[PDB]
Structures are given as C-alpha cells and as structure tokens.
Coordinates of C-alpha atoms in Angstrom, one line a residue:
X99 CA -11.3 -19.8 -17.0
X100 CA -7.8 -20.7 -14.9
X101 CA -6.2 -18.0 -15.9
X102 CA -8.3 -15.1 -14.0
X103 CA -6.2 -12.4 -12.6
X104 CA -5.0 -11.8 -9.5
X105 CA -7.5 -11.1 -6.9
X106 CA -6.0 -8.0 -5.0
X107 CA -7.5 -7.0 -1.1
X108 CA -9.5 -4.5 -2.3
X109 CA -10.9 -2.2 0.5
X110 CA -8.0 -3.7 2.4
X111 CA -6.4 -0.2 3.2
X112 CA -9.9 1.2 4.1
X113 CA -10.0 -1.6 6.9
X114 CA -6.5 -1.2 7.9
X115 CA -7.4 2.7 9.4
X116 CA -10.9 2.3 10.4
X117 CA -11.0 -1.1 12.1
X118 CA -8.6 -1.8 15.2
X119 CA -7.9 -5.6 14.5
X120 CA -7.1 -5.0 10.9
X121 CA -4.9 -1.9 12.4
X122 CA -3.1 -4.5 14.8
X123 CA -2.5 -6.9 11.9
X124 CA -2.3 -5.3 8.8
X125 CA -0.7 -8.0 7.3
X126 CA -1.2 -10.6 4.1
X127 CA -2.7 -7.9 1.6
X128 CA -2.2 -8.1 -1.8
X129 CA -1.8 -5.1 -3.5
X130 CA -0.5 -3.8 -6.6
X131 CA 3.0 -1.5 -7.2
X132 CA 0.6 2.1 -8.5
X133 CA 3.9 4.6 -8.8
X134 CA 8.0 4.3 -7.3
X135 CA 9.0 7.9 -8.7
X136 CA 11.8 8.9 -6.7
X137 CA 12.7 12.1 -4.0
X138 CA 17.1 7.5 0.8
X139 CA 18.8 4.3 -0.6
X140 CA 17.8 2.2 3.2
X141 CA 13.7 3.4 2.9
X142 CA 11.3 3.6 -0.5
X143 CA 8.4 5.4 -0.4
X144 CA 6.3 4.1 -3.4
X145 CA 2.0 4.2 -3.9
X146 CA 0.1 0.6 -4.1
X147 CA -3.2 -0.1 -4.8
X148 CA -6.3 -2.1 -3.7
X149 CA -8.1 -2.2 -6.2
X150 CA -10.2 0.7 -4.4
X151 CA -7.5 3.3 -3.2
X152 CA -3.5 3.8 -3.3
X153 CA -2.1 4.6 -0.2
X154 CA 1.8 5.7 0.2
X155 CA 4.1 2.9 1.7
X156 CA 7.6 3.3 3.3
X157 CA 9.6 0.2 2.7
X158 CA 12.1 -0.3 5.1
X159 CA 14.6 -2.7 6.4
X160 CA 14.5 -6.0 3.9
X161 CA 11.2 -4.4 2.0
X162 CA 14.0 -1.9 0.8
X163 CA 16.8 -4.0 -0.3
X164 CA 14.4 -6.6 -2.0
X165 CA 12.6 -3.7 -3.9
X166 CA 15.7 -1.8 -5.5
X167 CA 17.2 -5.8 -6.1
X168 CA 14.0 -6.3 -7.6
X169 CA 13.2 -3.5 -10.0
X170 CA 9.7 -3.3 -8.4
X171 CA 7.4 -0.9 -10.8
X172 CA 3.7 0.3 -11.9
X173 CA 1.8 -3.0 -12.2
X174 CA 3.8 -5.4 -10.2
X175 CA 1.5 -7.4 -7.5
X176 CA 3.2 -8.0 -4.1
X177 CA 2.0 -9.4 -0.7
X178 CA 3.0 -7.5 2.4
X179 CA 3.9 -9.6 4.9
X180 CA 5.9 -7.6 7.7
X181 CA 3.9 -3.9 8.2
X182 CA 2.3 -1.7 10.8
X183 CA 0.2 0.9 9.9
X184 CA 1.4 5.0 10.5
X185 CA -1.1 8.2 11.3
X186 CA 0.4 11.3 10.8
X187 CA -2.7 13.3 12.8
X188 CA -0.4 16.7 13.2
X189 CA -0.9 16.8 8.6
X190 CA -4.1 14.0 8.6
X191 CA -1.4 11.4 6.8
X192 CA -1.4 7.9 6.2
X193 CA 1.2 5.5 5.3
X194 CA 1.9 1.5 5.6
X195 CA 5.1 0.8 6.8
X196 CA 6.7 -2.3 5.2
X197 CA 9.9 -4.2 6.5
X198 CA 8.9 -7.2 4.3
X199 CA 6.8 -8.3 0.9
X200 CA 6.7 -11.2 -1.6
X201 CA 6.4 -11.0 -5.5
X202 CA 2.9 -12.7 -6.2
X203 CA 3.1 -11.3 -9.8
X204 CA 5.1 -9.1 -12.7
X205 CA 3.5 -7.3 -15.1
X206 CA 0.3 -7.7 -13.9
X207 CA -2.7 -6.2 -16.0
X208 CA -3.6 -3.0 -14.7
X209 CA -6.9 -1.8 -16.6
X210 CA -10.1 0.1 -16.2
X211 CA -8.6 1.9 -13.4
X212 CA -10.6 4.1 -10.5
X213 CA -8.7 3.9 -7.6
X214 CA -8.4 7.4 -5.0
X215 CA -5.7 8.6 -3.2
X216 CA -6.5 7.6 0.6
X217 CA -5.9 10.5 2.1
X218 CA -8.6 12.1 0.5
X219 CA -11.3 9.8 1.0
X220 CA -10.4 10.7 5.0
X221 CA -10.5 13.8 4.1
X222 CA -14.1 13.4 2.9
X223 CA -14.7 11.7 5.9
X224 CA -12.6 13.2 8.7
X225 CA -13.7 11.6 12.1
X226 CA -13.8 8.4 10.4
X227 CA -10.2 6.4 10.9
X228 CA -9.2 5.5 14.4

C-alpha cells in the first residue's frame, strides 16, 4: 500500500552507545515521542522510542523552544537532527542530548508495543557500550 507507516530507526539507540561512528554522529534517527511528563522551561527531558528501546532525551537550546511551541506528546514521530550522545558512568545513565528535531509526523499509530527502557538492556549487558 502507500500509505505504510513511518519507518522509525529501530536499534538506532542500541548503535548510538555501542558503535563509535554512530556515537560521533548520532544524528538523522527517527524516533517516536514515548512520554513528556514533567519534573526547567530552557531544557525537556522526555522518553522516545525506536521501535526497540526508549531512551531519555534532554532537549535543549532550539529542541526546547520548538517542543513546548509545539505541543510534542506520546506518539508524535520526530527526526533528530542536532544531538550528541551523554554517559553518565558514575550512575551507568544514558541520555541523547538534542539542540534540534523536525516533525516527520502527529499522531502517529503507536500499537503492539515492546519497547525496553535502555538503561536496562546495559544493565543486562554491562561491559557492552563504549
């Protein structure tokens, strides 16, 4: 059919912390808005999915004004285009920090759902990311 949904990267946030060139360029993913429940008005931290896992990301800079401009929520599909991934080794965290995203899609379906929380698959796996 033409009317297929949205491809999103999935296993893109799996690549982004285990492989260095993904690490260096984590940028072009399309991912999909998974929670934006609240605690800053300049930084929002909100989960997106692959498909595969949710992951937190910090929107900051024009990712935050273009976010709370554009009611982002559960289900929405964006494309990160400014980001650099974070490791917090000292509490084994991870977190994509985003200065800039585009709207692919609103309102995207969002069904059949199995996607893990990152942090735990590493925490499965712990000498695994870089």
């Amino acid at each position: 059919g033409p009317m297929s949904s949205v491809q999103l990267s999935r296993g893109d946030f799996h690549s982004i912390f285990t492989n260095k060139q993904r690490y260096d360029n984590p940028t072009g993913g399309v991912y999909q808005v998974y929670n934006t429940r609240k605690s800053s008005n300049r930084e929002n931290l909100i989960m997106i999915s692959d498909g595969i896992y949710h992951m937190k990301a910090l929107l900051r800079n024009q990712a935050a004004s273009k976010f709370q401009s554009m009611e982002l929520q559960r289900g929405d599909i964006i494309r990160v285009i400014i980001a650099e991934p974070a490791i917090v080794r000292e509490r084994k965290k991870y977190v994509l920090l985003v200065d800039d995203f585009e709207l692919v899609q609103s309102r995207a379906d969002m069904v059949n759902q199995t996607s893990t929380f990152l942090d735990n698959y590493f925490s499965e796996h712990p000498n695994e990311t870089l």
